[PDB]
Amino acid sequence: QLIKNGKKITAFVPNDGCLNFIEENDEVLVAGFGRKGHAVGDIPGVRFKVVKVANVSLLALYKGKKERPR
Amino acid sequence: PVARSWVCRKTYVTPRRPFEKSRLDQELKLIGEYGLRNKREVWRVKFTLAKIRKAARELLTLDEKDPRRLFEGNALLRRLVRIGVLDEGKMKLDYILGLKIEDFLERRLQTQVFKLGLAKSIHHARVLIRQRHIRVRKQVVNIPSFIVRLDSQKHIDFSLRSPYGGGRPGRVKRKNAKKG
Amino acid sequence: DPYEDFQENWNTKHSSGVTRELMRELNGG
Amino acid sequence: ELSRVDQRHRASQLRKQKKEAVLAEKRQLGGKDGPPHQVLVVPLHSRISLPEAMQLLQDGTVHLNELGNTQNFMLLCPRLKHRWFFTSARPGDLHVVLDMAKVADTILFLLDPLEGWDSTGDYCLSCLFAQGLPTYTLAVQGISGLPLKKQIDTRKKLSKAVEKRFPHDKLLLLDTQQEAGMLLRQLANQKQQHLAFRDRRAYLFAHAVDFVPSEENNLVGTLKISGYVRGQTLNVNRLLHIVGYGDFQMKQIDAPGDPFPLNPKVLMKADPGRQESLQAEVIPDPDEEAEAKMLEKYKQERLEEMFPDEVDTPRDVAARIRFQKYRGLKSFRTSPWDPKENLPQDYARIFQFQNFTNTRKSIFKEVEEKEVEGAEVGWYVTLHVSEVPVSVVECFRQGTPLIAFSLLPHEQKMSVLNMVVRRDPGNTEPVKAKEELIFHCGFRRFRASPLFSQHTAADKHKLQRFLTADMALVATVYAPITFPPASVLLFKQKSNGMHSLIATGHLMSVDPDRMVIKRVVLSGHPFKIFTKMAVVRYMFFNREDVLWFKPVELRTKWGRRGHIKEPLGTHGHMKCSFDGKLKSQDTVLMNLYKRVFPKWTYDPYVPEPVPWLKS
RNA sequence: ACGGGGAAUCAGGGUUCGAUUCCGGAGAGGGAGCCUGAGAAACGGCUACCACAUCCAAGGAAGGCAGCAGGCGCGCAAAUUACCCACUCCCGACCCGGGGAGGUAGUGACGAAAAAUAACAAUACAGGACUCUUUCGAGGCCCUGUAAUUGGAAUGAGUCCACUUUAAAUCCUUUAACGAGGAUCCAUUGGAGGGCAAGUCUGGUGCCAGCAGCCGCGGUAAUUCCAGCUCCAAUAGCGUAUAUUAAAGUUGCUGCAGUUAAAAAGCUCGUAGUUGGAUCUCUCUCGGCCGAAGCGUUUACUUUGAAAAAA
């Protein structure tokens, strides 16, 4: 649920084991998926993907460079 | 308001197609032949040639008795003779279009240190320039892509403070003399 | 043999790879 | 939107909407009326002695309220006209940190110039992040004590070695009080992180504890606890929980004069018997041998991460006797299950809800949307409690403070709490499904024996017999009811009473209706395969129990569904139809399921941990 | 949507951006009215009202950061409450005082320029090439390395006296002294099916987890997932998201299409618009023959001139 206008959004948590860095009510920077507001092939009606959770990067958590802050 | 100049300019263009064999091959042959570091040193000398071809290709539409073609076209050939890329008998404006990348890469200070015999390889010239062993007429030059002009080719030497020409030995020889 | 592996596997999942390998054999350097 | 002026107006309303809602909670803290600006200060690196820095920030007017060991004082500098309050603690000590950094408004970290933190400060840093961090600010002490060149590197050789804990923050150094004068302004104008737990309950901090016993032979009496009220309007007919010594009911509140006003005895409430709720948790009406355990716990754990529940089938006792109690589910998520078929006798000792969310929104509204006749916040109210033992008194003279906070209705009885944990990767030791662990569930402290479970949305939940390092698990235990949300910590004594932090997380819904299910997998082997039939050796041994477990569906390790068709051996063999053709590599196995209930090993007493060091 | 000078891209034509340091406009929370003065409807002036909001002893008093810093809020999104009038200039009675104009530092991978992370030599190879031997095999003749083989010679990065720089400092430039052998003083970011450079190698998983812009991959031999090795591309930089430009002759003036792929109005009349067939070969009143003054029906076109801010 977006901060700046209240709108709601389903975003895709990309790599494997990357839902396991997220809990509920967390603050998430979301990007586009790459097709400029259209869905990306396999996923139906999903136009966004998670970039950062809890002000740390997902590529930093997946590759183990950093720790999930609580 | 500030007293600063923001006038800058990029000195290279990247190709339109990134993964193209025999572009990759030809530039790797030009990297290995002339001791260059990365592709961007070929794309830089491709860019100054493309500026010289383009300005001559503009000057070839004006007629032979144009003012601008006679002035600015004689000043284009003068620089290309001066840096030693063209010769003197080929100063029509149509032997500009027969120039290549290798003519411009033979005039760097690196290949000239190799050509004069002050080095023994094209990678030995890069270090001998970069370690500050090479001077041009009085002045230590620290840059390998220093395009050597035609009059400054006869004065390239070994930098009177260096262990190679001057004589005071380096860091290593003096410590081994201390351990003697 | 790129000829046989192309003539067999031009229809399968490995078609693009065997066409790549066959052009590599034919063109050559 | 429509036409440039009803768009500029439409922005102005929503700008005014947001800009006024951010102000309705700013006056919760540190006004001129002044519930004092509590600032907890801890050093991370043990090179940093804490009396080095606190003397420098002492002087506006200093009021040294004396404590046991640490100097926990209050500050007034009226050139900016604010009332600060400074408490101080030590790294690694779980006792003196976690009890007053929970009611604090601000934490002030003191980092060393050289490194970021030692190993022991990283321990209490991990518990504070999971407890719920208030407003925090970095600080350093020895920057200008380095040479005039070697200080512009030392902030720069530090501030990237902090970001794997602290992603972005400036570092306010401490060398002077003119350096600290820029700290108290930065301390004053922050963004106030609102701890979501404390803004529904009325809490307090101990400034001076006084005691006189009713009788001396029974070693229990009545306390005169004094301190500011800092929560909501403190009702008199609510209960009172000291964070380390259980729950009880007080008998008298009274507001004396404020000993520390910003700019320089009446009894008002008494407890009746008609409104005061009764205190009962239940319904009244009805070395190398452990190393031998340790080496197998590096192995019996590892029989779970490669085999799900591969047990051995019983060769001696019959299969309708050893696995009598279980059952087979046709589909683990879409099966019917009566949630009250076999209630244990412990479930006749717990309390139920008609609808937990709708009774939460009615008890959430009354503290905020309804005004009660209790004492309002910001006051200085001392307090007479009824019956607390003498042991809480002299430990305050050692130096630890005692924190008491009010409770909501239905927060003193017993129910079945479900709580989400994630295993902290700082510990590497395995934990059984029914161990004894130290729980810190939202200002409480107790030992318990949980049931680890999986975190799904369906009604059934499969028991995980151990603790994994990546899946988020749910603990389930009998405990007193704490209304959500509540931050959870889990500890375990490794040796010498050192508490090893193993799991963090938050709270799910407290209810007994969560079905946690213990599985058992019966593995067999097919040894004569046919065209869509199979002869399965070793799964059973008798002939008769094959007709017992005939309706229980079968599965294989390669995804094939099947079922028992007939038996053919007088020994334990059977015929089983299948859907695909079985492979020679397969291992057909069936699943048996039953309900499971946790143990009642609740105790409100926790041993006080030692200073946590390394080994 | 502040406008221009301009900026990005670009064969030629074009398209899009231009809040932003120069010129011009406007405005100091929102409207309104004035005083003074050569000049203001002035806000680092005043008087009201509407909106916020500070002190108060409750009678009163004072406000306006879209100046420089700094704070909160907002948000994907942006630096120090630093030093100085020495420079460039401005104001004043003034060679003297003042200037958050401006300069100097700090933060700063916005972006642009140069550019290290090794060079060389002697051995040996079941390495290649050049002369001979039919061939075995004969050589400092030229090259190469999965030699963590040996060997000194060269050097910065750092550490650091001094000078120099500057208002005073820093930085760079110049020099002492120390400063390299796994020269551990280790280079990263994406990838290896095709588009598109580069492995149907090995282990794991088994339409799961996941990958994949697109096509597709994964159901027990996965060229594609998770990894190990190896290889590739750019390289102190490289991925991702979004805006935009080319690719797009997929907006078409150059330069598209309209039977069947999307598309010609049911037919005809008709005003505006747009477009329209041949044809036609410089002189009068004056000044010293050379200048005035007039033209001829009026224009479009083309060529020259002069005027077009600097950057």
Curated annotation (Swiss-Prot), chain A:
Subcellular location: Cytoplasm, Cytosol; Cytoplasm; Rough endoplasmic reticulum; Nucleus, Nucleolus
Modification N6-acetyllysine occurs at: 63
Subunit-level organization: Component of the 40S small ribosomal subunit. Part of the small subunit (SSU) processome, composed of more than 70 proteins and the RNA chaperone small nucleolar RNA (snoRNA) U3.
Family stated for the protein in its record: Belongs to the universal ribosomal protein uS12 family.
UniProt disease annotation: Brachycephaly, trichomegaly, and developmental delay: An autosomal dominant developmental disorder characterized by brachycephaly, ciliary trichomegaly, dysmorphic features of the face and hands, hearing loss, and developmental delay with short stature. Intellectual disability and autism spectrum disorder may be present in some patients.
Its job: Component of the ribosome, a large ribonucleoprotein complex responsible for the synthesis of proteins in the cell. The small ribosomal subunit (SSU) binds messenger RNAs (mRNAs) and translates the encoded message by selecting cognate aminoacyl-transfer RNA (tRNA) molecules. The large subunit (LSU) contains the ribosomal catalytic site termed the peptidyl transferase center (PTC), which catalyzes the formation of peptide bonds, thereby polymerizing the amino acids delivered by tRNAs into a polypeptide chain.
Name of the protein described by the UniProt record: Small ribosomal subunit protein uS12
Originating species: Homo sapiens
Part of the whole protein covered: 73 to 142 of 143
UniProtKB/Swiss-Prot annotation, chain B:
Positions of region (Disordered): 161-180
Modified residues (Phosphoserine): 152, 162
Modified residues (N6-acetyllysine): 65, 115, 154
Family that this chain belongs to: Belongs to the universal ribosomal protein uS4 family.
Subunit structure comment from the entry: Component of the small ribosomal subunit. Identified in a IGF2BP1-dependent mRNP granule complex containing untranslated mRNAs. Part of the small subunit (SSU) processome, composed of more than 70 proteins and the RNA chaperone small nucleolar RNA (snoRNA) U3.
Function: Component of the small ribosomal subunit. The ribosome is a large ribonucleoprotein complex responsible for the synthesis of proteins in the cell. Part of the small subunit (SSU) processome, first precursor of the small eukaryotic ribosomal subunit. During the assembly of the SSU processome in the nucleolus, many ribosome biogenesis factors, an RNA chaperone and ribosomal proteins associate with the nascent pre-rRNA and work in concert to generate RNA folding, modifications, rearrangements and cleavage as well as targeted degradation of pre-ribosomal RNA by the RNA exosome.
Protein name: Small ribosomal subunit protein uS4
Species annotation: Homo sapiens (Human)
UniProtKB/Swiss-Prot annotation, chain C:
Organism annotation: Severe acute respiratory syndrome coronavirus 2 (2019-nCoV)
Stretches for region Binding to 40s ribosome mRNA entry channel: 3-29
Superkingdom, natural source: Viruses
Function: Inhibits host translation by associating with the open head conformation of the 40S subunit. The C-terminus binds to and obstructs ribosomal mRNA entry tunnel. Thereby inhibits antiviral response triggered by innate immunity or interferons. The nsp1-40S ribosome complex further induces an endonucleolytic cleavage near the 5'UTR of host mRNAs, targeting them for degradation. This inhibits the integrated stress response (ISR) in the infected cell by preventing EIF2S1/eIF2-alpha phosphorylation upstream of stress granule formation and depletes host G3BP1.
Protein name: Host translation inhibitor nsp1
Subcellular location: Host cytoplasm
UniProt domain BetaCoV Nsp1 C-terminal: residue ranges: 1-28
Curated annotation (Swiss-Prot), chain D:
GO molecular function terms noted in the UniProt entry: GTP binding; GTPase activity; RNA binding; U3 snoRNA binding
Chief place of localization: nucleus
Compartments (UniProt record): Nucleus, Nucleolus
Ranges of Basic and acidic residues composition bias in the record: 1-9
Keywords, ordered alphabetically: Nucleus, Ribosome biogenesis
Alphabetical list of InterPro entries matching this protein: AARP2CN, Bms1/Tsr1, BMS1_TSR1_C, G_Bms1/Tsr1_dom
PROSITE patterns on file: G_BMS1 (PS51714)
Pfam families named in the record: AARP2CN (PF08142), RIBIOP_C (PF04950), Tsr1_G-like (PF22298)
Domain Bms1-type G: 35-193
SMART domains to which the protein is assigned, alphabetical: AARP2CN, DUF663
Gene Ontology CC, one term: nucleolus
GO BP: any one term: maturation of SSU-rRNA from tricistronic rRNA transcript (SSU-rRNA, 5.8S rRNA, LSU-rRNA)
PANTHER family documented for this protein: PRE-RRNA-PROCESSING PROTEIN TSR1 HOMOLOG, RIBOSOME BIOGENESIS PROTEIN
Known function: Required during maturation of the 40S ribosomal subunit in the nucleolus.
Protein name (record): Pre-rRNA-processing protein TSR1 homolog
Name of the coding gene: TSR1
